Amino acid sequence: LIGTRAKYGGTLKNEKGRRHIVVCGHITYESVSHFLKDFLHEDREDVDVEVVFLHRKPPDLELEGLFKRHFTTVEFFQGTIMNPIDLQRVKVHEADACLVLANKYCQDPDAEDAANIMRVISIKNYSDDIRVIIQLMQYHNKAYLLNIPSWDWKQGDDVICLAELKLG
């Protein structure tokens, strides 16, 4: 009943002249490790951008070890993007961009797309001038995002449609 104190919680510490991005959605060991290998590659330009991960379920032992090896550049927080309190904790309004990972191996692509679309609505509700990049499963769900009043491709909002790209 006493249990253990919440290992992942609290607010992200603010730093002067610091750039960070928020990554949400399908946060697993395989998805995070693959994303971090591509994001932090010494073949590309050196930029001081740290990744902040937000997820509901606590990470397993494998994921916790991965975060330890990237202690100086990767931060994890427990919470949901649909909670305005959790958006304040990760400082979404100060983030360079928000990335919404998708579960490509999902039983219902429509259900997965609906959940991710609501995440974009929650982020845009908190603030309108935040760049959002979201992985989409089906093309017919792209119309919903385009009809959002705060969605603007000019400002950097992008939709990565797996169905459109794969069949292309």
Binding site: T80, M82, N83, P84, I85, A111, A114, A115, I117, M118, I121, S122, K124, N125, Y126, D128, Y144, N147, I148, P149, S150
Partner: protein, 450 residues
């Protein structure tokens, strides 16, 4: 409540707050519009026996005297027994029970301690039609595009063919009350799956001016066909069962439909389209508006979308059962106010199972058409526009009562006076309240034959 909001936007917020018991005390410093709205939320409805001094005077003089002297709003009385809302030329009898809007039950005690020192149905309360079939009411995009639809009501329906039935008749009948002339009746167009509406057509056969458009309200092509930019009110309702996977995903379709219309552009923006949305989860009201601060444990009635008459939920109706126990007549007044008049005899006929039954108009049947109705007026122009320039609620209330018998209940005032077209509800402002030229007044207007 949704149907009454079509005639007067924001009425659902005003009525819902009336029967939720809240205690209001002035805060030290906060937003001026929040303070004005919070004062209105503290008003409830109370029943008190009228003083013997009121015996022998008409209702219009009785409610005017209560407002000016006792600072109480009297809107209905009990006549031996039926309840009349803002009656015209009705005298006050001995021990007459009156309905008052006041901050608490201690205020209404001032009233007692006062001294000088085939066109219509069988009941004749609703319009009737000779059972039009559903097939004749089905329109496609081309049919809806080439017909004029101005000032109509669009019902955006999200429902699977196997979804549980909602009371779609309970939304159209208040719009088909005998208080409205046939020419001023608002056309109702339902956008949704015909398979679901087919099960609901049994109670909609005899209601005039009903159109059904197959498709989904999310598509912009269907919305442009029915001219949502010219509609008087767009209602978004969902009859689908909740998957219970996540509370934040329960209102995904309703939120998306609301946002789609807001970003719509017509050759006039879609953000000016009056919209009402019902939420199966009151915590999803944070996504309805963008220019506000959302906090999870804030009550629904304190949120900006609810204060503006944009959102609605069934959680605000939980206080009705406590109200009903203390005063049975309180529930009768609510039902007569929002259903357009639903006498117990009408419910007996409906309980038979033959649907709405018409009747031949008689001498008294046309007299049932003479009753007050919920309406909204604007102070921008007209004989009452003089009070908007200077600004005094007490002067406007008295002048409207004498000139036409209209009873002012509250105000629909712009949130910002400097630039968003959002208006919030102020219920029963004090007589010293300052009006504005861009203010709208909730009124109970009498029936004018002709």
């Amino acid at each position: 409540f949704i149907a009454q909001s079509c005639l007067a936007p924001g009425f659902s917020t005003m009525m819902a707050n009336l029967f939720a018991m809240r205690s209001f005390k002035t805060s030290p410093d906060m937003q001026s519009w929040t303070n004005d709205y919070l004062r209105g939320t503290g008003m409830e409805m109370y029943t008190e026996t009228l003083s013997p001094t009121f015996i022998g005077i008409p209702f219009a003089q009785a409610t005017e005297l209560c407002f000016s002297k006792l600072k109480l709003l009297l809107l209905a009385i009990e006549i031996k027994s039926k309840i009349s809302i803002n009656p015209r030329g009705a005298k006050i009898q001995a021990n007459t029970q009156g309905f008052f809007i006041a901050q608490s039950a201690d205020e209404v005690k001032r009233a007692w301690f006062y001294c000088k020192a085939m066109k219509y149905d069988s009941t004749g309360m609703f319009h009737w039609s000779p059972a039009k079939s559903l097939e004749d009411c089905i329109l496609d995009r081309n049919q809806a595009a080439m017909t004029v639809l101005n000032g109509h009501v669009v019902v955006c329906l999200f429902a699977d063919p196997d979804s549980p039935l909602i009371g779609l008749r309970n939304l159209v009948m208040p719009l088909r009350a005998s208080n409205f002339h046939y020419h001023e009746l608002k056309h109702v167009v339902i956008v949704g799956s015909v398979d679901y509406i087919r099960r609901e057509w049994k109670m909609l056969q005899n209601l005039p001016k009903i159109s059904v458009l197959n498709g989904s309200p999310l598509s912009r092509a269907d919305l442009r066909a029915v001219n949502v930019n010219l509609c008087d009110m767009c209602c978004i309702l969902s009859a689908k069962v909740p998957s219970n996977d996540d509370p934040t995903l329960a209102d995904k379709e309703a939120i998306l439909a609301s946002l789609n219309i807001k970003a719509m552009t017509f050759d006039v923006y879609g953000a000016n389209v009056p919209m009402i949305t019902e939420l199966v989860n009151d915590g999803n009201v944070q996504f309805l508006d963008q220019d506000d601060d959302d906090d999870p444990d804030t009550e629904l009635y304190l949120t900006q979308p609810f204060a503006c008459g944009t959102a609605f939920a069934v959680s605000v109706l939980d206080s009705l059962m406590s109200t009903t126990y203390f005063n049975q007549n309180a529930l009768t007044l609510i039902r007569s106010l929002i259903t357009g008049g639903a006498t117990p005899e009408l419910e007996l006929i409906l309980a038979e199972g033959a649907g709405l039954r018409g009747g031949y108009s008689t001498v008294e049947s046309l007299s049932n058409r003479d009753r007050c109705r919920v309406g909204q007026i604007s102070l921008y122009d007209g004989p009452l526009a003089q009070f908007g320039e200077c600004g005094k609620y007490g002067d406007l209330f008295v002048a409207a009562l004498k000139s036409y018998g209209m009873l002012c209940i509250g105000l629909y005032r712009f949130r910002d006076t400097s630039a968003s077209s959002k208006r919030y509800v102020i219920t029963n402002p004090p007589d010293d309240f300052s009006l504005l030229p861009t203010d709208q007044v909730f009124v109970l207007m009498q029936f004018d034959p002709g």
